[PDB]
Design a protein around this ligand. Structure first.
Ligand SMILES: NC(=O)C1=CN([C@@H]2O[C@H](COP(=O)(O)OP(=O)(O)OC[C@H]3O[C@@H](n4cnc5c(N)ncnc54)[C@H](O)[C@@H]3O)[C@@H](O)[C@H]2O)C=CC1
Length: 248
C-alpha cells in the first residue's frame, strides 16, 4: 500500500515545521522552568514538537546574515549606554495566537521596547503574554510587591536597563530579553516614584519614569515605560545574548 508510505512522509513534513534553532530554544527554556521547579522542591537530538506546540506561540529563527537580523541587532544595541560587551547570539520572531488581534494599535504612539525577564519565566510569557501583577489589598503594600510605578507592565528603551532583569539562566548561562510593540498613547512623564498606580492618570494611556540627569534629578536611574493593560503590548522578538563580563 502507498497509504502507508504517504503517512510516514506526512509525519516527516509535520516534524520539519519546527526548525533546529527554534527546537533548541524551546528545549532550553523548558529545561530552565523544569530545573527551577525541581530546585524549589528538591527533585543531534529528536524534535521537541510537543513542547513547542504547547506554547501556542509561533517562533521563527532569524538568520545571522539577513537584513532583519542586522537591523534588529542594531536597534537592541542602539541605546546601550553601559558600553558593556554584549554578544547578540540569536533572534527569533515571535507571534502569540490572540496577541495580534487584541493589540490596541489605534491608540497611536506605538514604540518597540525592551522587557527583560529571567529565563524561567519565558515559557509562561510565550504561552500567556506579559501579564499584569496582582495588586495587594489585604495587607500593607510592600516595595517588594510593587514596581516603583505601581502595578503595571514595565519596559525600557535601553539594553543597559534590560540587563538588570535578564539574568543568566542556569542551563546555558545565556540571557533572554523580549522586544515588544507597546501602545504608549498619551504618555505622562514622571520624575517621582508612585507605587500606588493601577492605571495611567486620567487622560493618559501610559507613564514614563524619566531617568535622572545632572540637570534634572529624578527618582529613576533608568527610563521606565509602564502600561496598565495587557493589550497595550504585542511581543515581536526574542533576543538571546550573553555577556563575557559574566564568565569567571
Ligand atoms: N522588566 C523590565 O525589563 C524593566 C523593569 N523595570 C524595573 O523593574 C521594576 C519592575 O520589575 P519587573 O520584573 O518588570 O516587574 P514585577 O516586579 O511586577 O515582576 C513581574 C515579573 O513577571 C514576569 N511576567 C509577566 N507576565 C508573565 C507571564 N505571563 N508568565 C511569566 N512571567 C511573567 C515579568 O517578566 C516580570 O519579571 C520597576 O520598579 C523598575 O525599577 C523598569 C524598566 C524595565
Amino acid at each position: 500500500s502507498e497509504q502507508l508510505q504517504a503517512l510516514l512522509l506526512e509525519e516527516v513534513m509535520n516534524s520539519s515545521t519546527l526548525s533546529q534553532e527554534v527546537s533548541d530554544l524551546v528545549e532550553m527554556i523548558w529545561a530552565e522552568a523544569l530545573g527551577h521547579l525541581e530546585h524549589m522542591l528538591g527533585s543531534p537530538n529528536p524534535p521537541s514538537l510537543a513542547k513547542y506546540r504547547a506554547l501556542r506561540c509561533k517562533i521563527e529563527h532569524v538568520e545571522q546574515n539577513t537584513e532583519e537580523f542586522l537591523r534588529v541587532r542594531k536597534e537592541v544595541l542602539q541605546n546601550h549606554h553601559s558600553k558593556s560587551p554584549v554578544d547578540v547570539l540569536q533572534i527569533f520572531r515571535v507571534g502569540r495566537v490572540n496577541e495580534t488581534t487584541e493589540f490596541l494599535s489605534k491608540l497611536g504612539n506605538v514604540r518597540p521596547l525592551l522587557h527583560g525577564s529571567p529565563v524561567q519565566n519565558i515559557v509562561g510569557i510565550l504561552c500567556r503574554g506579559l501579564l499584569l501583577p496582582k495588586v495587594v489589598e489585604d495587607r500593607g503594600v510592600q516595595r517588594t510587591d510593587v514596581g516603583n510605578l505601581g502595578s503595571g507592565i514595565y519596559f525600557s528603551d535601553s539594553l543597559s536597563t534590560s540587563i538588570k532583569y535578564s539574568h543568566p539562566g542556569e542551563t546555558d548561562g545565556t540571557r533572554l530579553l523580549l522586544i515588544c510593540d507597546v501602545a504608549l498613547g498619551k504618555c505622562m512623564d514622571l520624575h517621582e516614584k508612585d507605587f500606588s498606580l493601577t492605571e495611567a492618570p486620567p487622560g493618559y494611556d501610559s507613564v514614563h519614569g524619566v531617568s535622572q540627569t545632572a540637570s534634572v534629578t529624578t527618582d529613576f536611574e533608568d527610563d521606565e515605560f509602564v502600561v496598565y493593560k495587557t493589550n497595550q503590548v504585542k511581543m515581536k522578538y526574542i533576543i538571546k545574548f550573553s555577556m563575557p563580563g559574566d564568565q569567571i
